Design a protein around this ligand. Structure first.
Ligand SMILES: Nc1ncnc2c1ncn2[C@@H]1O[C@H](COP(=O)(O)OP(=O)(O)OP(=O)(O)O)[C@@H](O)[C@H]1O
Ligand SMILES: Nc1ncnc2c1ncn2[C@@H]1O[C@H](COP(=O)(O)OP(=O)(O)OP(=O)(O)O)[C@@H](O)[C@H]1O
Ligand SMILES: O=P(O)(O)OC[C@H]1O[C@H](OP(=O)(O)OP(=O)(O)O)[C@H](O)[C@@H]1O
Ligand SMILES: O=P(O)(O)OC[C@H]1O[C@H](OP(=O)(O)OP(=O)(O)O)[C@H](O)[C@@H]1O
Ligand SMILES: [Mg+2]
Ligand SMILES: [Mg+2]
Lengths: 209, 209
């Protein structure tokens, strides 16, 4: 395959990227959500789509198994973005990285334990607050951790806050804003610029509105 | 909560554990698959259930946020089981860890690159074969990696082989057999043995048939 391979993840990123792609002349020929398939052609024969776990988008792009991808800033901060180029903030899948814990619970006076998927972000954020924390690596359902005493706080993405509130948790700190970013393989950017450029220019134009 | 907290994961482990629990006098009062809730009571007021990602079951048990759990041997090998007790092989969710690649593709004569979730298992297995491999950490959809040239082989769990065959892959090596195991927190085993013992004895009796 000589064209461009685009890495996306299911749910919000796929849904919110599709209008950008459509305006750039690229449409999927079926719903990837209803298929076990992982490689999908598009209306443009020079563009195909991989459907990946959000965590794996940076990895496929870095290695060049995809030429470009749409990844959350949260995932990029955690993975490290040093071996891809971040070209555009697409302003989609907007949310916040936050700390949270049981509503009105006092923090213990000791080294804190942070239950999170975002281990590097947690360590970096608490380092800025003057705290060298322990982290408990989890892969999902962070909202449960404080309810069963696994760690003193969590770090997770928050949008509406409904998940926190549903579980009797409240946000303690805003860490940063998160949105999805267009990342490109550093070699693909040099070798396939002629294919990438009109798509990048389209995305840039679309996000300006 | 003074009773026992049991960690399970959705899908096969939950489905195949339920008959064992039922025979031990423990039944869920609703389908956890149809709820956003993560803590569930049971017919026994001394037992509650956490529904976790399979990757997080060992973590909750190790820290004592759950007293015991059902985890795949694959997850235990990868996580490390040094700070929990593995008490029973429950003989459920049976599968194999295997290596696989594109059908009839020759291996390149260089350091191999293994795309896998099971990074520690991959390194250990290839070490037994006299190979010091590079690993590309992925979180899902391992079957895609060889189709886009991400790594030379994958390590993943295989049951029927249908996923491999669907994607033009074939298993190369059998690494080991996998089944779900009953793990216990090392402190809970000492402090709550009176609550655990009849349940463990029930499970043991059930699996003998
Ligand atoms: N509630 C939300 N609102 C808006 N954007 C969100 C929200 N939650 C997550 N995101 C963003 O969307 C990205 C992808 O989320 P997605 O749900 O696909 O990932 P995930 O739940 O980590 O996947 P997995 O099933 O592998 O655990 C996140 O990395 C983040 O940037
Ligand atoms: N096809 C299979 N047949 C039987 N047992 C399996 C199969 N695939 C996985 N297992 C076993 O079941 C366990 C749990 O699998 P499950 O699908 O819940 O995890 P997962 O796909 O890693 O979860 P996640 O959604 O977090 O990626 C595995 O760790 C393994 O031991
Ligand atoms: O602040 P809120 O609006 O409640 O959203 C925050 C939640 O969104 C994400 O879950 P998602 O909706 O992706 O479901 P998942 O965790 O099952 O993937 C994330 O894991 C948070 O739990
Ligand atoms: O050899 P097979 O019978 O094809 O099974 C192997 C597959 O089973 C598991 O997937 P699962 O069914 O758990 O779905 P998931 O990967 O979407 O979780 C695993 O991730 C393999 O892909
Ligand atoms: Mg999600
Ligand atoms: Mg699975």
């Amino acid at each position: 395959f000589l064209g461009l391979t685009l890495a996306l993840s299911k749910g919000r990123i796929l849904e919110e990227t599709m209008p950008l792609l459509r305006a750039a002349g690229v449409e999927l020929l079926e719903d990837p959500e209803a298929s076990r398939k992982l490689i999908f052609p598009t209306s443009n024969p020079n563009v195909r789509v991989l459907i990946l776990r959000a965590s794996d988008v940076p990895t496929y792009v870095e290695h060049g198994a995809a030429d470009f991808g749409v990844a959350g800033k949260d995932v990029l901060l955690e993975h490290g973005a040093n071996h891809v180029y971040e070209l555009l903030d697409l302003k989609i899948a907007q949310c916040k990285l936050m700390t949270a814990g049981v509503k009105d619970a006092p923090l213990p006076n000791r080294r804190l334990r942070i239950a999170t998927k975002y281990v590097n972000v947690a360590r970096a954020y608490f380092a800025s607050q003057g705290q060298q924390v322990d982290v408990i690596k989890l892969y999902g359902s962070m909202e449960l951790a404080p309810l069963v005493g696994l760690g003193d706080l969590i770090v997770d993405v928050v949008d509406t806050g409904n998940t926190l509130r549903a579980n009797g948790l409240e946000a303690r700190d805003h860490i940063c804003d998160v949105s999805s970013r267009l990342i490109v393989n550093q070699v693909s950017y040099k070798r396939k610029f002629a294919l990438l450029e009109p798509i990048l220019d389209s995305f840039k134009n679309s996000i300006n509105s």
